[PDB]
Design a protein around this nucleic acid. Structure first.
Lengths: 195, 47, 174, 49
DNA sequence: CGTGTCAGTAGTGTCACGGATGC
DNA sequence: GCATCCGTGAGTCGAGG
RNA sequence: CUCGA
């Protein structure tokens, strides 16, 4: 940049990828993969087949791939992340609140560094932490070591509300608790009829 | 609210769609006030 | 010139490469949360960029001033806001889930109120449904129905007792 | 500052790596501020100079 | 409000299986 | 062209803490 | 956490 900065443009972080997706020809890269697919060696063709599977979806559907890079993150309504009061006087909140709070804390600090004109090393190292925070909010533990809460317990992300046996699908949609029901011990009754 | 609707569509949420849903921005990181139990303005529980 | 402003950025990147990794370990021992230690590191080095007195003397240990700033940051976080909230997480076990009682008593009362309401004159029924169901004021109902102020007071006064008659005739508990 | 959805970066297979033909680890070095990436280069101006 | 004699991780005994990731 | 490594999954219901 | 089929 100090020498030939007039000739090229580079960047770091996520905003750079946002620029690469913008400076990307969907139809050309799709047909370029097709040309490789029509006549190619299976060793290097299978790797181009699966690429077309991703690119062709963005081409036909009409939705831009830019959605993979976020400028704003949505906040789930509070009753789905409720904060309850305890009989000891203190409180207890969902782990989603601590993840949203950490994203808010680091995003406001980044706004301070941008305003102050702080050195690029602080702003870039701050932008990295905001990436890890949103990554923790959506799927904590996916990359690297998870954000531990008090007691080395991994915080539950938004995607943890849908995963596995404890997720929303299996725990609250495929099976539910029902009214007008009961349970007791069973005892054999010979005098009873089969019905 | 009848129970017959054919398709359920899913798609990528534009950053502009996120603003279309949002009833406001969560600026402050605070939650509530630990005396009045009233949520702080622009917090994670802002009324 | 431009090189003088760039030398300040190379100076900050220098103390990053020599102090940031060690300062992160220090805050990690004091808090135990790595995501919090990163927050303390960024705030401590931000105050180093704002204090040229600490970056001036290289013959004086600047690492010690960083550990002390980080210590007085972790001790401030440890006050009131952490005091009440930090204790529990709903995701964590041992916390009772919030429950809402059933609407059985309310549904039965609503049914009995609807029955006693059907046995009222259209005037009295359209006045109690505008005072208690819509929560308007006495003059608001008077303005809507085109009647007098005391007319709304008298209709409400009787219709209430008319409902008490029908409820006590059906055995509703006082 | 813009941010990436971790579902499409770290989720296997890397959806971003398939779109931009970038390697997963190279993408990992880009997002988390470990390596710059060239967004554009004036190739004609470079030739004329 | 300001801070300054070195100041240094937690936690560590699953596994089968497939396919993208990587030298 | 291939060994590596990552990510995925691993019965149901009930009781007291 | 511990137990029941």
């Amino acid at each position: 940049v100090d020498r030939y900065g007039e000739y090229f443009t580079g960047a770091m972080g996520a905003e750079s990828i946002q620029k690469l997706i913008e400076n990307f020809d969907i139809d050309a890269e799709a047909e370029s993969l097709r040309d490789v697919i029509r006549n190619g060696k299976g060793q290097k063709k299978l790797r181009a087949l699966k690429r077309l599977k991703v690119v062709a979806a963005f081409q036909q559907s009409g939705n831009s791939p830019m959605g993979m890079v976020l400028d704003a993150v949505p906040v789930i309504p509070p009753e789905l992340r409720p904060m309850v009061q305890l009989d000891g006087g203190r409180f207890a909140t969902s782990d989603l609140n601590d993840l949203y709070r950490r994203v808010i804390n680091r995003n406001n600090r980044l706004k301070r560094l941008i305003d102050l004109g702080a050195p690029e090393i602080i702003v870039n190292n701050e932008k990295r932490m905001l990436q890890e925070s949103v990554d923790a909010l959506f799927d904590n533990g996916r990359r690297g070591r998870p954000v531990t809460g008090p007691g080395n317990r991994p915080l539950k992300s938004l995607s943890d509300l849908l995963k596995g046996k404890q997720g929303r699908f299996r725990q609250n949609l495929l099976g539910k608790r029902v009214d007008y029901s009961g349970r007791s011990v069973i005892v054999v009754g010979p005098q009873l009829k089969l019905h | 609210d009848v129970n017959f609707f054919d398709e359920l569509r899913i798609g990528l949420a534009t950053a502009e769609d996120i603003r279309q849903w949002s009833y406001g921005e969560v600026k402050k990181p605070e939650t509530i006030n630990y005396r009045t139990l009233k949520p702080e303005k622009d917090g994670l529980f802002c009324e | 010139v431009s090189g003088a402003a760039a030398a300040e950025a190379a100076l900050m990147r220098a103390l990053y490469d020599e102090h940031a990794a060690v300062l992160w370990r220090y805050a990690l021992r004091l808090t135990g949360d790595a995501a919090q230690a990163e927050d303390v590191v960024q705030e401590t080095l931000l105050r180093a960029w704002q204090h040229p007195e600490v970056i001036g003397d290289t013959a004086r240990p600047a690492r010690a001033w960083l550990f002390t700033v980080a210590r007085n940051m972790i001790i401030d976080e440890r006050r009131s806001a952490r005091f009440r909230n930090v204790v529990g997480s709903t995701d964590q076990s041992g916390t009772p889930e919030q429950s809402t009682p059933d609407e059985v008593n309310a549904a039965l009362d609503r049914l009995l109120i609807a029955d006693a309401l059907a046995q009222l004159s259209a005037e009295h029924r359209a006045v109690i449904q505008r005072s208690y169901y819509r929560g308007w004021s006495t003059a608001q109902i008077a303005t809507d129905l085109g009647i007098a102020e005391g007319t709304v007071k008298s209709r409400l006064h009787y219709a209430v007792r008319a409902l008490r008659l029908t409820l006590q005739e059906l055995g509703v508990t006082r | 500052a813009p941010v990436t959805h971790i579902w499409y970066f770290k989720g296997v297979p890397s959806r971003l790596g398939y779109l931009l033909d970038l390697a997963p680890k190279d993408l990992e070095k880009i997002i988390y501020f470990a390596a710059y990436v060239i967004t554009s280069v004036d190739e004609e101006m470079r030739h004329n100079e």
